[PDB]
RNA sequence: UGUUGGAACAAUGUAGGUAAGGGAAGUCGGCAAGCCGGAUCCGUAACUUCGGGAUAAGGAUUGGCUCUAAGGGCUGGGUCGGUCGUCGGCCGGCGCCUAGCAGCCGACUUAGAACUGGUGCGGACCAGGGGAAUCCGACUGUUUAAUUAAAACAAAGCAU
RNA sequence: UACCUGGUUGAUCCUGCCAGUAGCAUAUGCUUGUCUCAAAGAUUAAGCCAUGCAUGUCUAAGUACGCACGGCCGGUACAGUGAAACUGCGAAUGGCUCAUUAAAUCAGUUAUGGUUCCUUUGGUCGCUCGCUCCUCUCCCACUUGGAUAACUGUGGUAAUUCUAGAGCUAAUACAUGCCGACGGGCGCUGACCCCCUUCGCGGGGGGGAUGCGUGCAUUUAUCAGAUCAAAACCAACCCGGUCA
RNA sequence: GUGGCGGCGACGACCCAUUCGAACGUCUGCCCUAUCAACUUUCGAUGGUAGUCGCCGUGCCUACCAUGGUGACCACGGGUGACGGGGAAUCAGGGUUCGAUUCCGGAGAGGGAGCCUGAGAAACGGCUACCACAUCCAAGGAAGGCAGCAGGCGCGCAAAUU
RNA sequence: UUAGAGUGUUCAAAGCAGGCCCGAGCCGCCUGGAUACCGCAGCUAGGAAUAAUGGAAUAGGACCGCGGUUCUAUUUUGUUG
RNA sequence: CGCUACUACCGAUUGGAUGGUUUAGUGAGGCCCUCGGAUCGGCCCCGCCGGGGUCGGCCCACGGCCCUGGCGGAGCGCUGAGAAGACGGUCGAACUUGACUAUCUAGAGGAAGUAAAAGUCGUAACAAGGUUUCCGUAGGUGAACCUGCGGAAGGAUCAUUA
């Protein structure tokens, strides 16, 4: 019933616009597809001119990216922490564009431990001995052992991101519109904008 | 009001179709082919009035369906197939071939041409359109998306296509020293060398033209269509050679031939 | 406060602030490199919009708005609500019956480049067309045009 | 428990309550009791001495439990070397709490949101029935202690 | 065809209107013999509706056992007409009237670098590439599933373009899905192996078994996208021709 | 007893195009009224950041801030016995009046609202309710929209043959 | 639609029609359906009288002069780095 | 001012009739969502045959392993399709009552204006209209009007000799 009209509100000149037609099909709205965290449930919508839309109601995995290493992976969301539009959209655990979530760090850590072969998690020394020692060392007559040494240096992750990997969660904005496309895809947070976003979470409570 | 339109009334239809007022109410509505309404010529009106081979729609209905009409090499089967600039059409049963270019007033004059000129045609481009896989693409007046052209093809040019496989041969670039014929607008159907193109960033780029008769005019870049190199047109032109004559001058020609052929 | 005002994080999308990977000689250098696209039609991109630190979403030279179609002028009158100004625009309408003109005026809102303090009121400006920036914000400001008939150098 | 107790539970009382349907039909008369009753948010007429009328009339909300946002105080400014007992008085040298940030405390408040209840929610108590007119007196005030609280006296104003 | 007359006064001049004069659109009276064109339920009631028509669709090129005709033709299927009926397209075009509507609609002018578009016309449509079962078909691709319709057969209510229950049947309807495209190709990991040369560590220079991903759109992120005028350093020794 | 064979009908994908248009915009243009001089609002009234919805651009909608837009060059509110325009009557030069009317654009099917199918309806010779007027009835229920062509009713100064 | 050109609808109102040449022998010819007008607003380009409006007054135009900081590369032995 | 007709007005009824816009309450219906599970098909735990391979079997009666057409009992046990219906949201016609506004109307009694024919009382104005006329303001009188204060001449003097 809702319409995205421009003829139901006053002019700039304070006057009132008497309409000259009843509500029209080619300008229409539908209730919000306010998608939460849960089992993957994406339900269909048909729109004008075909090109049927896919709208999401409950999502858990998304194609979040790590911008400082040109790598991206599928990753299981586990939280929602901060939305600049509403406050009542962080209690509800909703999901919308530019909604700061906590993604699972498992694929990225695993990838890091396989790319540069430098450990990124150690609290109990539980695991992670066999693979890392092997790969850095010789395996095809001294060729590879050179190129991993090039990567031993310049392996960068800030303590702003180092502590998150130790903790298993990565702050990550969403940059894909879950309501209309359905995919909860975005980027991980790092650098200064991580720093700015970190303080807001620290002292949001007021 | 609720969707497409499917009834074109009388002389509300384009004026160059050369129609009446007391043939009822409606006019044939072209089938949305390779040209706009306001540039095309329905194939039906080319068989009742311009040619006067037939009498009614029916006698036209049975001709086009008997598969004698040939447009652009492959036969058509709709009564109202839009025609357009530089389109070749052939009649194999009687043996003629028409060219259908604009007159000096704009009427799509009947123009019989030789089978040699019935092979190719001249088509302007609209955008060089390099697409997926690094593949260069073109578009022409009649919506021929030609892949893989000569890279020198840039804009406003004229191509020559064999009318069996497209495959442009013998292109001519847009330059400021070449013949060009104006299509569309009040200046419809004059011929002359360009001699100028005064640019206007953000609006219609006005192109002046000087004629071989010494006269001059100007149009916008869209209405320009190049039909040859130098002062040589690739195509023969009808009587008058597309050179506009004032109504005073056209009056003289009418009076002289009077009582001299009938 | 006194520097920026925001709830979300504002940045130029095209630029990627987090290219910072090398420690080597300097961890940080000439940082968050600038993005700017010049409009055509000869309008000179102000030096403020090149070396500036501000971030804007609809700035003609440092945003995504696409100026086209209509270019007009005006006389600025108000320096009210942030990031847009209100310009009177005087012109004459001709009455057919009499052989005489009749003055009118129509004043409209236009966005601004937030580069700018030092845009006084009552001064001419050249304004260009744009996509419908807001309910009543269509035209956008391209370059201001009056400082000589004013105070000290 | 106001100068006494015990047993029962009749009428008439005295003092409290409720009652199906109609709602002043009762009566000299709406006498008596009965509705409205606090607060927040909207809305407010005829008249007028322009101050009032006005809480005019007329609406909506009110519980719990879980949150959200906003409204404040006190303290602050450097490695370095020697002297003096990188911490400090001193020196010299630096910092320049430089955009105003950082840490510790502190009272009750106001606005919004989610959920829940047999839709109950100023839950006892405290707490206005309204509207349209007429007569009289301007008003606030006073009086017939022990039947008359008024339209009676006073009253500022006016005038002899 | 840039036009004026009667009227205040005993008479005159003028301001001024009243009345005249012609066209025009509707009504109306009287009258009307021919022909050629031609308006016609707008004004008030965007008030009311009996009655009948105003939206159907077939080509060699989606379905064919009505038995409704007709094949001669019963044989290892389907003459051919063919009404029904499933499917696709059509009803969103035409016609009516002006109740709304005062920068609203609409006219002239422009951008849609800010979107969608059945159909007509042009383009591509060797998409990826990697399993073959138990002791005997992994799997159909030289064809993979069941379902309703008309049709037959029982009915229901007073009634309608109302439908239920039972038995078969097809696809260009709803679904399922395959060597072939036989990737030699390509990029990342990449057992290694080989030489020059460093005792050696080392560096250069080589070719590579294994395994993963494969421009067909959607979604997100990152990269480069020009270099317009020039000569030397330390320093990799590299593309090269001159004697050395 | 096998492998290759052209012409076509139908078909779906879209950086795609081309056409058919459709939709929100840009600048200027409207009749009478001051016995309409101040209008607009947290409930979007002008704007900013972020975002759901939309086919997209935008207060379109929600949150959080900012306090703003128009108006004597006539806003605002009212009236029209006003659909707009191409045009029409009248005329020396200016003009005054009229435009429902067959072309272009808009709105509608008794008043409103909602929605399925479809690329394109908020379609009504499509459905869903409500309201008023209503047609069959076994009293249990069913169906409709002549501001389409003819017709009749009522209306009238006034308008055709089922 | 207004104007207007060409044309004998018997004239005209109209309409965009029609005229030859012969039994027909060509296996037909010649042509028509134009032009002006269409403010105001927008685009374009010559004219610069009249009318707005501008410029160095507490310094501003001119001289490719000789100096600093700060950076963006083209390409020379280093093909690339 | 016993003198009628018409036009409009104020007016107690704190009046009536119609629209039109709205606050508030109730809110049928479609749509989105969270549930839902009448019913309809496939799977697997079972038995038996025939089809082919198979141990015991020379092949077979029948059995063990696999696959298949068919036969039946049972877990309805795991899975796809799914209507009726509901909590909630959204849009929201309509009804009931308030406010606002508009045009039209009945109303005792009062007071205007116009036309009436040959009415009664007067004579105010036009001649120095017999008090010179008129303007402003104020009081009074049956009525035109009279008077007081200041003006104008549209006055009956364009002027009156130191």
XYZ file of N, CA, C and O (backbone and C1' of nucleotides) in Angstrom, chain H residues 42-106:
455
model
P 5.419 -42.884 -4.675
O 6.830 -42.221 -4.336
C 7.886 -42.237 -5.286
C 9.186 -41.734 -4.705
C 9.943 -42.672 -3.775
O 10.671 -43.694 -4.432
C 9.860 -40.549 -2.800
P 11.010 -45.062 -3.656
O 11.915 -44.612 -2.421
C 13.217 -44.078 -2.624
C 13.863 -43.649 -1.328
C 14.310 -44.766 -0.407
O 15.524 -45.371 -0.813
C 13.187 -43.132 0.857
P 15.552 -46.934 -1.182
O 15.496 -47.664 0.233
C 16.689 -47.959 0.942
C 16.678 -47.359 2.324
C 16.317 -48.299 3.463
O 17.393 -49.115 3.896
C 15.059 -46.325 3.669
P 17.152 -50.679 4.182
O 16.459 -50.728 5.616
C 17.233 -50.872 6.799
C 16.408 -51.390 7.954
C 15.893 -52.818 7.827
O 16.856 -53.788 8.204
C 14.121 -51.404 8.491
P 16.812 -55.275 7.591
O 15.298 -55.734 7.765
C 14.470 -55.937 6.631
C 13.243 -56.744 6.966
C 12.905 -57.853 5.982
O 13.639 -59.042 6.215
C 10.977 -56.565 6.385
P 14.129 -59.940 4.977
O 12.835 -60.774 4.579
C 12.305 -61.754 5.460
C 10.980 -62.275 4.967
C 10.977 -62.852 3.560
O 11.434 -64.191 3.509
C 9.185 -61.341 3.784
P 12.390 -64.672 2.311
O 11.380 -65.041 1.136
C 10.223 -65.825 1.387
C 9.152 -65.568 0.358
C 9.498 -65.968 -1.068
O 9.210 -67.338 -1.300
C 8.468 -63.808 -1.015
P 10.202 -68.258 -2.163
O 10.861 -67.239 -3.191
C 11.088 -67.615 -4.539
C 9.948 -67.192 -5.427
C 10.324 -66.875 -6.865
O 10.429 -68.035 -7.674
C 8.994 -65.125 -6.008
P 11.871 -68.568 -8.148
O 12.052 -67.949 -9.606
C 11.251 -68.391 -10.692
C 10.751 -67.234 -11.522
C 11.780 -66.541 -12.402
O 12.011 -67.220 -13.624
C 10.516 -64.919 -11.237
P 13.453 -67.144 -14.330
O 13.819 -65.590 -14.324
C 13.521 -64.765 -15.443
C 14.622 -63.765 -15.716
C 16.039 -64.217 -15.397
O 16.599 -65.037 -16.407
C 15.696 -62.044 -14.539
P 17.536 -66.278 -16.007
O 18.973 -65.623 -15.814
C 19.687 -65.087 -16.918
C 20.705 -64.071 -16.470
C 21.801 -64.584 -15.550
O 22.849 -65.246 -16.238
C 20.911 -62.589 -14.666
P 23.508 -66.571 -15.611
O 24.508 -66.028 -14.492
C 25.850 -65.709 -14.827
C 26.555 -64.932 -13.739
C 26.979 -65.698 -12.497
O 28.123 -66.515 -12.685
C 26.040 -63.634 -11.861
P 28.117 -68.035 -12.159
O 28.105 -67.904 -10.571
C 29.234 -67.413 -9.862
C 28.938 -67.259 -8.390
C 28.610 -68.543 -7.642
O 29.779 -69.212 -7.200
C 26.998 -66.878 -7.130
P 29.913 -70.807 -7.324
O 29.962 -71.311 -5.813
C 30.965 -70.861 -4.912
C 30.517 -71.009 -3.479
C 29.999 -72.386 -3.092
O 31.028 -73.303 -2.769
C 28.456 -70.752 -2.380
P 30.937 -74.824 -3.275
O 29.596 -75.373 -2.608
C 29.488 -75.491 -1.196
C 28.144 -76.019 -0.752
C 27.555 -77.180 -1.529
O 28.205 -78.416 -1.287
C 25.847 -75.634 -0.972
P 28.508 -79.406 -2.517
O 28.142 -78.535 -3.798
C 27.640 -79.145 -4.976
C 26.141 -79.002 -5.067
C 25.526 -79.323 -6.419
O 25.341 -80.709 -6.624
C 24.684 -77.263 -5.663
P 26.238 -81.466 -7.713
O 26.095 -80.549 -9.004
C 27.217 -79.886 -9.570
C 27.122 -79.907 -11.071
C 25.739 -79.582 -11.623
O 25.526 -78.191 -11.818
C 26.509 -81.629 -12.550
P 25.194 -77.232 -10.569
O 23.991 -76.324 -11.077
C 24.089 -75.583 -12.283
C 22.918 -75.865 -13.186
C 21.550 -75.755 -12.535
O 21.081 -74.419 -12.453
C 21.685 -77.779 -13.750
P 20.355 -73.889 -11.118
O 18.828 -73.742 -11.549
C 17.776 -74.036 -10.642
C 17.191 -75.400 -10.912
C 16.197 -75.913 -9.884
O 14.887 -75.412 -10.086
C 17.789 -77.598 -10.358
P 14.212 -74.461 -8.984
O 14.132 -75.379 -7.679
C 13.119 -76.365 -7.542
C 12.791 -76.651 -6.095
C 13.191 -75.597 -5.072
O 12.273 -74.516 -5.006
C 13.715 -77.777 -4.265
P 12.708 -73.030 -5.447
O 13.055 -72.290 -4.082
C 12.323 -72.543 -2.895
C 13.251 -72.686 -1.718
C 14.303 -71.597 -1.576
O 13.817 -70.405 -0.978
C 15.346 -73.701 -1.390
P 14.557 -69.006 -1.264
O 15.828 -69.053 -0.310
C 15.668 -69.218 1.090
C 16.982 -69.485 1.773
C 18.073 -68.455 1.543
O 17.922 -67.292 2.336
C 18.969 -70.607 1.238
P 18.181 -65.842 1.694
O 19.733 -65.591 1.940
C 20.285 -65.681 3.242
C 21.788 -65.745 3.191
C 22.469 -64.622 2.426
O 22.611 -63.436 3.187
C 23.351 -66.685 1.720
P 22.191 -62.021 2.552
O 23.324 -61.731 1.469
C 24.590 -61.216 1.854
C 25.303 -60.588 0.683
C 24.438 -59.746 -0.241
O 24.229 -58.432 0.247
C 25.766 -61.219 -1.527
P 22.941 -57.588 -0.216
O 23.260 -57.195 -1.727
C 24.339 -56.328 -2.044
C 24.544 -56.208 -3.535
C 23.328 -55.804 -4.352
O 23.049 -54.413 -4.299
C 24.416 -57.614 -5.412
P 21.546 -53.893 -4.037
O 20.964 -53.619 -5.493
C 21.667 -52.807 -6.423
C 21.621 -53.406 -7.804
C 20.251 -53.452 -8.458
O 19.932 -52.232 -9.097
C 21.329 -55.553 -8.684
P 18.471 -51.592 -8.938
O 17.752 -51.933 -10.319
C 16.340 -52.055 -10.398
C 15.938 -53.206 -11.282
C 14.487 -53.646 -11.180
O 13.602 -52.838 -11.938
C 15.889 -55.544 -11.065
P 12.287 -52.213 -11.255
O 11.113 -53.198 -11.684
C 10.437 -53.038 -12.921
C 9.527 -54.207 -13.201
C 8.530 -54.537 -12.099
O 7.355 -53.748 -12.161
C 9.682 -56.498 -12.700
P 6.669 -53.212 -10.811
O 5.915 -54.491 -10.238
C 4.985 -55.197 -11.041
C 4.739 -56.585 -10.509
C 4.366 -56.681 -9.041
O 3.011 -56.358 -8.789
C 6.010 -58.292 -9.533
P 2.610 -55.555 -7.455
O 2.356 -56.711 -6.390
C 1.547 -57.828 -6.725
C 1.830 -59.008 -5.831
C 1.773 -58.742 -4.336
O 0.452 -58.733 -3.825
C 3.713 -59.993 -4.844
P -0.311 -57.341 -3.583
O -1.071 -57.558 -2.201
C -0.637 -56.898 -1.024
C 0.078 -57.843 -0.093
C 0.501 -57.255 1.241
O -0.557 -57.209 2.182
C 2.316 -58.429 0.299
P -0.840 -55.860 3.006
O -0.069 -56.079 4.382
C -0.491 -57.057 5.322
C 0.483 -57.145 6.465
C 0.792 -55.822 7.155
O -0.133 -55.516 8.184
C 2.812 -56.901 6.572
P -0.559 -53.995 8.475
O 0.759 -53.326 9.070
C 1.165 -53.588 10.406
C 2.609 -53.212 10.641
C 2.949 -51.733 10.566
O 2.604 -51.023 11.743
C 4.556 -52.971 9.360
P 2.465 -49.422 11.711
O 3.949 -48.896 11.976
C 4.687 -49.320 13.114
C 6.104 -48.795 13.096
C 6.268 -47.339 12.698
O 6.039 -46.458 13.783
C 7.865 -48.672 11.552
P 4.592 -45.794 13.997
O 4.070 -45.551 12.514
C 3.533 -44.291 12.127
C 4.481 -43.534 11.229
C 3.929 -42.228 10.668
O 4.998 -41.295 10.506
C 4.463 -43.679 8.889
P 5.810 -40.745 11.783
O 7.122 -41.650 11.822
C 8.025 -41.584 12.916
C 9.302 -42.338 12.633
C 10.200 -41.750 11.553
O 11.035 -40.722 12.059
C 9.969 -44.098 11.238
P 11.481 -39.491 11.127
O 12.640 -40.091 10.210
C 13.996 -39.672 10.355
C 14.575 -39.199 9.042
C 14.242 -37.754 8.675
O 15.307 -37.184 7.909
C 13.341 -39.201 7.046
P 15.359 -35.597 7.643
O 15.210 -35.472 6.061
C 14.235 -34.619 5.476
C 13.755 -35.161 4.150
C 12.843 -34.257 3.343
O 13.540 -33.236 2.651
C 11.970 -36.450 3.349
P 13.123 -31.699 2.862
O 11.958 -31.458 1.803
C 12.210 -30.762 0.592
C 11.404 -31.323 -0.554
C 10.044 -30.688 -0.797
O 10.102 -29.451 -1.484
C 9.809 -33.024 -0.821
P 9.053 -28.290 -1.119
O 7.659 -28.843 -1.647
C 7.300 -28.735 -3.016
C 5.854 -29.103 -3.226
C 4.840 -28.244 -2.482
O 4.511 -27.061 -3.190
C 4.345 -30.534 -2.153
P 4.172 -25.702 -2.406
O 2.885 -26.054 -1.540
C 1.624 -26.269 -2.153
C 0.633 -26.841 -1.172
C 0.315 -25.967 0.031
O -0.653 -24.976 -0.250
C 0.804 -28.150 0.768
P -0.556 -23.535 0.445
O -2.076 -23.154 0.720
C -3.047 -23.296 -0.304
C -4.301 -23.966 0.200
C -4.926 -23.361 1.444
O -5.683 -22.196 1.182
C -4.815 -25.693 1.698
P -5.722 -21.017 2.268
O -6.691 -21.576 3.402
C -8.010 -21.998 3.088
C -8.623 -22.791 4.215
C -8.661 -22.100 5.566
O -9.753 -21.212 5.687
C -7.885 -24.321 5.825
P -9.500 -19.652 5.954
O -8.792 -19.613 7.378
C -9.531 -19.919 8.548
C -8.638 -20.293 9.703
C -7.847 -19.169 10.340
O -8.629 -18.387 11.222
C -6.453 -21.050 10.045
P -8.287 -16.837 11.451
O -6.981 -16.866 12.356
C -7.015 -17.450 13.646
C -5.707 -17.259 14.365
C -5.163 -15.843 14.370
O -5.746 -15.055 15.392
C -3.441 -17.365 13.807
P -5.529 -13.466 15.418
O -4.056 -13.289 16.000
C -3.774 -13.583 17.359
C -2.304 -13.454 17.672
C -1.637 -12.151 17.276
O -1.913 -11.086 18.166
C -0.254 -13.963 16.670
P -2.315 -9.645 17.588
O -1.040 -9.201 16.739
C 0.207 -8.982 17.382
C 1.308 -8.616 16.417
C 1.003 -7.544 15.391
O 1.010 -6.232 15.923
C 2.178 -9.307 14.361
P 0.190 -5.062 15.186
O 1.108 -4.665 13.949
C 2.443 -4.221 14.141
C 3.214 -4.222 12.846
C 2.644 -3.351 11.739
O 3.026 -1.994 11.867
C 3.123 -5.486 10.873
P 2.000 -0.821 11.489
O 1.918 -0.878 9.904
C 3.068 -0.636 9.109
C 2.769 -0.852 7.652
C 1.584 -0.072 7.109
O 1.945 1.245 6.732
C 1.409 -2.340 6.459
P 0.941 2.475 6.961
O -0.114 2.319 5.788
C 0.307 2.425 4.442
C -0.695 1.824 3.496
C -2.102 2.381 3.568
O -2.238 3.622 2.905
C -2.191 0.029 3.463
P -3.091 4.802 3.575
O -4.528 4.157 3.794
C -5.348 3.829 2.685
C -6.407 2.816 3.044
C -7.560 3.311 3.893
O -8.514 4.007 3.116
C -6.837 1.179 4.648
P -9.255 5.307 3.690
O -10.781 5.072 3.297
C -11.189 5.079 1.936
C -12.089 3.912 1.607
C -13.504 3.979 2.158
O -14.365 4.728 1.318
C -12.575 1.839 2.572
P -15.362 5.831 1.925
O -16.126 5.064 3.085
C -17.169 4.160 2.772
C -17.605 3.373 3.976
C -18.201 4.172 5.117
O -19.558 4.507 4.891
C -16.644 2.616 5.968
P -20.180 5.848 5.516
O -20.510 5.445 7.016
C -21.417 4.391 7.288
C -21.215 3.828 8.670
C -21.472 4.780 9.824
O -22.845 4.914 10.129
C -19.436 3.656 10.181
P -23.406 6.301 10.700
O -22.642 6.484 12.082
C -23.064 5.779 13.237
C -22.384 6.290 14.480
C -22.353 7.798 14.661
O -23.572 8.336 15.145
C -20.222 6.909 15.123
P -23.907 9.898 14.949
O -22.817 10.650 15.834
C -22.824 10.540 17.250
C -21.545 11.052 17.861
C -21.255 12.525 17.662
O -21.967 13.328 18.582
C -19.287 11.250 17.282
P -22.100 14.909 18.354
O -20.638 15.467 18.636
C -20.306 16.804 18.313
C -18.852 17.087 18.572
C -18.239 18.164 17.694
O -18.522 19.473 18.148
C -16.846 16.277 17.665
P -19.209 20.532 17.157
O -18.105 21.662 17.008
C -16.996 21.702 17.891
C -15.707 21.846 17.131
C -15.775 22.733 15.903
O -15.681 24.108 16.225
C -14.653 20.725 15.365
P -16.611 25.174 15.471
O -15.882 25.375 14.074
C -14.482 25.597 14.014
C -13.968 25.430 12.611
C -14.809 26.082 11.530
O -14.534 27.463 11.407
C -14.216 23.884 10.872
P -15.714 28.497 11.090
O -15.850 28.430 9.508
C -14.700 28.424 8.677
C -15.021 27.858 7.320
C -16.347 28.299 6.728
O -16.290 29.589 6.151
C -16.120 25.964 6.484
P -17.623 30.474 6.025
O -18.289 29.938 4.685
C -17.527 29.881 3.491
C -18.155 28.974 2.467
C -19.609 29.251 2.146
O -19.757 30.324 1.236
C -19.292 26.931 2.452
P -20.722 31.554 1.587
O -22.071 31.194 0.826
C -22.080 31.086 -0.585
C -23.125 30.117 -1.071
C -24.545 30.360 -0.600
O -25.197 31.411 -1.288
C -24.042 28.065 -0.421
P -26.347 32.254 -0.551
O -27.568 31.238 -0.466
C -28.092 30.635 -1.638
C -29.050 29.522 -1.302
C -30.247 29.915 -0.457
O -31.273 30.500 -1.235
C -29.302 27.897 0.360
P -32.385 31.422 -0.545
O -33.324 30.377 0.194
C -34.323 30.820 1.093
C -34.716 29.731 2.052
C -35.364 30.203 3.340
O -36.736 30.503 3.192
C -33.674 28.664 3.854
P -37.320 31.886 3.754
O -38.170 31.448 5.025
C -39.215 30.498 4.893
C -39.579 29.860 6.211
C -39.853 30.802 7.367
O -41.143 31.377 7.319
C -38.441 29.079 8.101
